[PDB]
Design a protein around this ligand. Structure first.
Ligand SMILES: CC(=O)N[C@H]1[C@H]([C@H](O)[C@H](O)CO)O[C@@](O[C@@H]2[C@@H](O)[C@H](O)O[C@H](CO)[C@@H]2O)(C(=O)O)C[C@@H]1O
Ligand SMILES: [Ca+2]
Ligand SMILES: [Ca+2]
Ligand SMILES: [Ca+2]
Ligand SMILES: [Ca+2]
Ligand SMILES: [Ca+2]
Ligand SMILES: [Ca+2]
Ligand SMILES: [Ca+2]
Lengths: 200, 193
C-alpha cells in the first residue's frame, strides 16, 4: 500500500463550449483524485492571468474529504456572460478564448494545465426568426404608422423565442430589421411581411 | 298667427382633428314651441361634406323647441385622415350655414357655423415618460430604445394605439400619429446617463 499520495487530480473538460454575447451561459468541469479529495482549482491563460473578469465559478464543496471520487466527481459550475460588445473579428474562427485549468489535491499535487475553449458568437447566430403572419397594407411602398405597429406585433408574435430586449424596426416598404441586444441583426424581406390589401 | 322664424344657436368653437370623430349640437327655438326641420348647406348650395351626419330625432313635434327645452340637434362626423391643411390656418376650416323652419313654414335666415380642422398633433401633447438610464447618451442600445418606447407608451394611454413611437440614437423620441403629423420629445426629457 502506497505510503503517500503522489498523483495529481484528473480533470474532464467540456468539449463544445459555445456562448452568445449578452446571454448567460454555464459549463461544468468534472474532477477526481485518487484520494477522493480536491482542494481547489486555477483557471489561467497557460499560467498567466485569466483576463476574463466576466467568468466565474463556485468554490462550494472545495477541499472537503470525499468531494472528488470516481463515483462522485467534483462538479465545478463555471458561468458568466460574454460582454454585449465583445469584438468578433472578420474570421469567426477567431471568436474564442483558449484557456487552461488545473487542480490541487490535499497532498500538494497539482495537475498539469489542460486546455478548454470558450467560443463566443453574435446573438443572431442563435436566433432564426419565423416569418410573421402577413400584414395587409394600403400602399406597399409607404406603410402607415398603424401598419408598422401591426407588422412589428406580427413579427414579435411569430417569434416568442427571440429576446424581449431585441428591437424590431419596420421600414417604409415593410422591410423588417430585428436588432438583437448585441446589435447583431436578422432581416425579413418585405415580400414575406406585407401584401397589398386591395389585390388580396 | 305665427309669423316669426325659429332662432338658432351654434357652437362657437367647433374644432375637429383629422381621422377622429367629433360631435357638436345645434340648439333651436321657436316662439310656437315647435320646430319642423332644419337644413345644412353651403350658403344655400349643397353641403358637400358627406362625412358629416346629424340626427333628426324629435323633429316636427309639438313642444320640441321651447325657450326652456330647445331642440338639440346632434351633429357628428370624421374629417378625412388625409384632408389637406393649408399653410394659413385661417383657411383650415369649412364655413357652412344652417336654417330651420316651424310648422307654419316660417324659415330662418342662413346662420353661419364653422368647422375648424387640424392635424392630430394639434390635439395630442405627450406626457413625460419615466426616465430611462442609458450607458451612452449618444448611442442607445436596442434594449434601451425598447425601454424608452415602453415608457413613452405607458405614460400616454390617451395617444392613439395606432400612433408609432420611434427612438433615435440619442434617445430623441418621434411620435407619428395616424394622419402622419408628429410630436417630438427631446432626449433630455427621456434619457439620462
Ligand atoms: C478575439 C481573439 O482575438 N481571440 C483569440 C485569442 C486571444 O488572442 C486571447 O486568448 C485573449 O487574450 O487567442 C487565441 O489564441 C491563443 C494564442 O494567442 C496563444 O499564443 O496560443 C494559444 C494556443 O492554444 C491560442 O491559440 C485563443 O485563445 O484560441 C486565438 C483567438 O482568435
Ligand atoms: Ca492525489
Ligand atoms: Ca439569425
Ligand atoms: Ca314661429
Ligand atoms: Ca325636448
Ligand atoms: Ca402635439
Ligand atoms: Ca393644441
Ligand atoms: Ca415598437
Amino acid at each position: 500500500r502506497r505510503a503517500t499520495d503522489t498523483t495529481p487530480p484528473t480533470i474532464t473538460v467540456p468539449s463544445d463550449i459555445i456562448a452568445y454575447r449578452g446571454e448567460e451561459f454555464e459549463f461544468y468541469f468534472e474532477i477526481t483524485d485518487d484520494s477522493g479529495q480536491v482542494k481547489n482549482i486555477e483557471l489561467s491563460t497557460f499560467g498567466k492571468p485569466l483576463g476574463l473578469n466576466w467568468l466565474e465559478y463556485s468554490e462550494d464543496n472545495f477541499n472537503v474529504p470525499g468531494n472528488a471520487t470516481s463515483d462522485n466527481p467534483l462538479r465545478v459550475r463555471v458561468h458568466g456572460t460574454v460582454p454585449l460588445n465583445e469584438p468578433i473579428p472578420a474570421d469567426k474562427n477567431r471568436a474564442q478564448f483558449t484557456r487552461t485549468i488545473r487542480a490541487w489535491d490535499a497532498a500538494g499535487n497539482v495537475s498539469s494545465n489542460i486546455t478548454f475553449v470558450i467560443k463566443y458568437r453574435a446573438q443572431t447566430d442563435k436566433y432564426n426568426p419565423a416569418d410573421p403572419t402577413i400584414t395587409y397594407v394600403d400602399r406597399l411602398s409607404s406603410l402607415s404608422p398603424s401598419e408598422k405597429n401591426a407588422v412589428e406585433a406580427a413579427v414579435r408574435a411569430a417569434n416568442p423565442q427571440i429576446p424581449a430586449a431585441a428591437r424590431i424596426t419596420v421600414s417604409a416598404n415593410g422591410t423588417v430589421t430585428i436588432t438583437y441586444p448585441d446589435s447583431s441583426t436578422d432581416t425579413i424581406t418585405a415580400n414575406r411581411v406585407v401584401k397589398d390589401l386591395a389585390s388580396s
